[PDB]
Design an enzyme around this catalytic site. Structure first.
Site, short mmCIF file in Angstrom:
data_model
loop_
_atom_site.label_atom_id
_atom_site.label_comp_id
_atom_site.label_asym_id
_atom_site.label_seq_id
_atom_site.Cartn_x
_atom_site.Cartn_y
_atom_site.Cartn_z
N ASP A 156 -0.21 5.18 0.78
CA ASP A 156 -0.42 6.15 1.83
C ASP A 156 -0.33 5.50 3.20
O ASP A 156 -1.06 4.56 3.50
CB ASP A 156 -1.80 6.80 1.66
CG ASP A 156 -1.80 7.91 0.63
OD1 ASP A 156 -0.74 8.54 0.43
OD2 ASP A 156 -2.86 8.14 0.03
N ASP A 174 0.85 -1.19 0.00
CA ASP A 174 0.00 0.00 0.00
C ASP A 174 0.89 1.24 0.00
O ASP A 174 2.06 1.19 0.37
CB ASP A 174 -0.91 -0.02 1.23
CG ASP A 174 -1.61 1.30 1.48
OD1 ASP A 174 -2.39 1.73 0.61
OD2 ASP A 174 -1.40 1.91 2.55
CL LIG Z 1 -5.22 3.37 -0.90
MG LIG Z 2 -2.72 3.13 3.74
#
Ligand SMILES: [Cl-]
Ligand SMILES: [Mg+2]
Ligand SMILES: [Cl-]
Ligand SMILES: [Cl-]
Ligand SMILES: [Cl-]
Ligand SMILES: [Mg+2]
Ligand SMILES: [Mg+2]
Ligand SMILES: [Mg+2]
Ligand code: NA
Ligand code: NA
Ligand code: NA
Ligand SMILES: [Zn+2]
Lengths: 243, 242
Positions: free
Chosen positions: B10, B8
């Site tokens: 962010d 992932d």
């Molecule tokens: Cl995301």
């Molecule tokens: Mg995240």
């Protein structure tokens, strides 16, 4: 300079539609500005004017009137502000929005996307297809609409439903309808100018015929209006007025 | 045997909505010499470029913007899918029409604009309008907690459409997310599951129910590790690939 003002629509008058102003036009305007004040007015918002006319737009024009003058700058500083919810109230705003949402939900189209209602300072922009649609999708609707008259019927129904409530409805561009308080076309910016004592306010626009977004300011007795074909035409006329 | 580390973005490779630090980007390129690496996020390709670099496709073995609805492998674009193609234009329009009519019948203090935001992988639907101001968001959020406006809306949407293969979820303070079943981060696994990797490690910061890493984390095709921050991501990778 200080005695007259040349007030220009932007899209199609100072720039090619939606495009950045040319260096030649920019150079012409600042030379013209030595003989007259200059101002720009358009339906687009401030950020769009910055993109097309330069981030320093408020320094390059004596007046800058994004959103038809609902936002307004004079000599690089903001004038007063008004917005549609402050004038109309939240109840009328919601009635307008609810009617448009329900109406669009009943239009049969090849495609629907998003941003059916764009909420701006001086108007609602309403689109049956959605203003986030792609260019291929936008032309498809535009060509369909010219055959089915979807927007024309929508405008007629809006005028019937909201008769007397102080709103104007107009076809805008290829996929939208503009909803705004009466007088909040380009004439609104004249409110910031009419008492300044200018001997003449010249106005230049490319859509001065009935239904075009320069028509009312062009015909207003407070302006001396000119119709232009393109920026080169605007230069030619201005050179004749200010040799 | 071949492994893949799938991240992932962010909160996992970067601080939320911020550019990757030079420290983390350098660590990733070293790690890439030991395992393949890939990144997946809900944001679009241009947002991944803003946070991970315009040459992101050359720095990762796989790049999956929009949860993998767009896919890059080895610097090349593989394929694309979108919600209107999967559902068909008729169903898309039925969903949009239902939402527009429903919102028109909700009584609120204020309505604004962008009630339906159309993305290639989902619709974002808001009774007040996604363009509303910060003050207006809080006003709606607090009213919604007392009046259950979004909860009733999601229930009615599920009743009307769920048989079309759609998921509906309350999102943030003002919105409802609408997307085909499985179009969370798990979507990108179709591009990986037949590649022959012995292990697909997955790293994310929102791996609990409701978080946008939860489904891919709990999916049996991945070996998931939860991270608290980019520095925690680096710690775990350093233990897995000494
Ligand atoms: Cl995301
Ligand atoms: Mg995240
Ligand atoms: Cl305009
Ligand atoms: Cl909308
Ligand atoms: Cl864990
Ligand atoms: Mg024009
Ligand atoms: Mg006139
Ligand atoms: Mg797993
Ligand atoms: Na804008
Ligand atoms: Na089902
Ligand atoms: Na679960
Ligand atoms: Zn594919």
């Amino acid at each position: 300079p200080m005695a007259t003002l040349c007030l220009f629509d932007m899209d199609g008058t100072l720039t090619a539609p939606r495009q950045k102003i040319t260096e030649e036009m920019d150079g012409f305007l600042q030379k013209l500005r030595q003989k007259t004040k200059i101002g720009v007015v358009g339906g687009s918002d401030f950020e769009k004017l910055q993109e097309q006319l330069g981030n320093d737009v408020v320094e390059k024009y004596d007046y800058v009137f994004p959103e038809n003058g609902l936002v307004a700058y004079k000599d690089g500083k903001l004038l007063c502000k008004q917005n549609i919810q402050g004038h109309l109230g939240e109840d009328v705003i919601q009635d307008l929005i609810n009617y448009c949402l329900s109406y669009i939900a009943n239009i049969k189209l090849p495609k629907k996307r998003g941003t059916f209602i764009e909420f701006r300072n001086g108007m609602l922009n309403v689109s049956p297809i959605g203003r986030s649609c792609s260019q291929e999708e936008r032309i498809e609707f535009y060509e369909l609409d010219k055959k089915e008259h979807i927007r024309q019927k929508f405008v007629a129904d809006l005028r019937k439903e909201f008769a007397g409530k102080g709103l104007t409805f107009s076809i805008g561009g290829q996929i939208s309808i503009d909803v705004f308080p009466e007088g909040w076309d380009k004439r609104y910016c004249l409110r910031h100018l009419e008492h300044a004592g200018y001997k003449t306010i010249y106005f230049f626009g490319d859509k001065t015929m009935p239904g075009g977004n320069d028509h009312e300011i062009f015909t207003d007795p407070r302006t001396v209006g000119y119709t232009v074909t393109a920026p080169e035409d605007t230069r030619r006329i201005c050179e004749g007025l200010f040799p």
